[PDB]
């Protein structure tokens, strides 16, 4: 019961929303794996006439690659209360977002007979803080 | 122009503003009169003005009658008396006029009117027992400025 309910890190997405690159090199070295470009939609007056074109990049970290990053990433930002998604996620920082969820998430990500996670099984801001706080730092 | 030109319902409903342009504004200044803050149920007497024939009443007549009716209520009950009258209909029907002979005769927009079936409530006033004979008089003046004959019916009141 309690084991199949205790949270885990789904993914850690580190991204840099520039606007026009040379920044791929830093993310690659700080995360470990290979990064990916980021395009945009809708023409903007801030010199964005080319729809599909590089603006930024991101990296989705999973498993160890994610934890080994968080250990040397969390000690760099003062986490707050408001800095938490109603779902149970948080973004701080070069942005760094941590997606958290319970053991049976695959049900909503798979192809065959997928189903959305019930609100009860959906993580909570409180349950989120606790789990994280219970791992090398303080809250609020 | 005479009401003879528009009083009868003899054309299709012409109200789709998305297809009609240049429609003249409504001369009807207000629809809520008296004390619009107090409720209708806070009054012992509720007298309505009922139209006895199905007709089309132009916004000019609507304003003219609503005016001469409420202008009386003001005179008799003061500018802030304990009454509250209501004009429930709104000029939805757009009117034309073929103002060339019968060639390309579809007319231009000249006004608006409110369609009212027989037996409908054009006006409904809410007053106290004492001021009941005043509203009846305001309505007597009002039915004089609209095409049909009317009935002044007391909907809530056995004080007589």
């Amino acid at each position: 019961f309690h084991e199949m309910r205790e949270p885990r890190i789904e993914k850690v997405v580190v991204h840099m929303g520039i606007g026009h690159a040379n920044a791929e090199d830093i993310l690659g070295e700080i995360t470990g794996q290979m990064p990916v470009r980021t395009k945009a939609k809708r023409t903007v007056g801030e010199f964005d006439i080319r729809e599909g074109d590089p603006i930024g990049a991101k990296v989705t970290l999973r498993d160890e690659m994610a934890e080994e990053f968080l250990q040397t990433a969390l000690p760099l930002a003062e986490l707050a209360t408001s800095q938490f998604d109603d779902t149970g996620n948080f973004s701080f920082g070069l942005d760094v977002t941590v997606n958290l969820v319970r053991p049976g998430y695959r049900v909503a990500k798979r192809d065959k007979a997928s189903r959305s996670i019930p609100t009860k099984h959906r993580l909570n801001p409180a349950d989120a803080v606790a789990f994280i706080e219970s791992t090398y730092d303080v809250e609020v | 122009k005479p009401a003879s030109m528009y009083r009868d319902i003899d054309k299709p409903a012409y109200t789709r503003r998305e297809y009609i342009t240049g429609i003249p504004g409504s001369k009807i200044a207000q629809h809520k009169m008296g004390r619009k803050q107090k409720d209708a149920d806070d009054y012992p007497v509720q007298i309505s003005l009922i139209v006895e024939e199905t007709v089309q009443l132009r916004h000019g007549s609507l304003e003219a009658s609503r005016l001469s009716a409420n202008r009386h209520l003001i005179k008799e009950l003061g500018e802030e008396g304990d009454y509250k009258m209501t004009l429930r209909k709104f000029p939805h029907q757009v009117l034309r006029e073929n103002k060339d002979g019968m060639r390309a005769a579809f007319g231009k927009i000249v006004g608006t009117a409110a369609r009212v079936q027989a037996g409908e409530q054009l006006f409904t006033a809410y007053c106290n027992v004492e001021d009941a004979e005043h509203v009846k008089e305001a309505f007597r003046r009002a039915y004089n400025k609209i095409t049909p004959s009317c009935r002044i019916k007391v909907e809530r009141g056995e004080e007589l």
């Binding site: 192809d111 065959k112 007979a113 997928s114 189903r115 | -």
Partner: protein, 186 residues
């Protein structure tokens, strides 16, 4: 849900189990579907045809009933998949079924996968099914040689329950041998 105007998906689309767009293109052939479905532990293969109140399964085979012919191995792998297909394909021949079209449901058409293995089995059983040989896994991986070589990187036994230490793709050969035999109580 929301109101009267609202549109609720067809039950099997709601459930995310049936791809109706692919189903129509499938049915257009006029032949029966060789429904190839797979689970975490097992593999199923049904020879389905169309019917007035719903589909009709004329023949079928489940990896579970594979042991009934001497299968002491797991049931969610390549040799298992192929064999289940061959079994199903054989029962199909008996029921009068001679041709079919592979229906892989919501599975992906990945080269060498289990559904193509299931397909190779049914075809081998004597069924005429539109296929493409270069999308099928090579004979050895079908046998289960990929797992024996995985067990070679031992140090720790691959199989928990004692089937054997080094594993036997020869067991596959034994079973296939058993099925192709004219006798066998289907």
């Amino acid at each position: 849900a929301t109101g009267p105007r609202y549109k609720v998906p067809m039950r099997r689309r709601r459930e995310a189990r049936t791809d109706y767009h692919q189903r129509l293109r499938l049915l257009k052939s006029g032949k029966p579907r060789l429904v190839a479905r797979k689970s975490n532990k097992h593999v199923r293969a049904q020879l389905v045809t169309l019917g007035p109140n719903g589909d009709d399964t004329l023949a079928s085979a489940h990896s579970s009933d594979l042991a009934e012919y001497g299968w002491e191995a797991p049931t969610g792998n390549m040799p298992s998949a192929y064999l289940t297909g061959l079994l199903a394909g054989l029962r199909a021949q008996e029921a009068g079924v001679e041709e079919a079209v592979l229906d892989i449901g919501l599975n992906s058409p990945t080269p060498g996968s289990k559904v193509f293995a299931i397909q190779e089995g049914a075809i081998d059983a004597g069924l005429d099914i539109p296929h493409n040989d270069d999308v099928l896994a090579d004979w050895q991986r079908t046998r289960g040689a990929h797992i024996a070589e995985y067990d070679e990187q031992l140090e720790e036994p691959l199989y928990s329950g004692d089937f054997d230490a080094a594993d036997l793709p020869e067991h596959f050969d034994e079973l296939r041998e058993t099925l192709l035999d004219g006798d066998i109580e289907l």
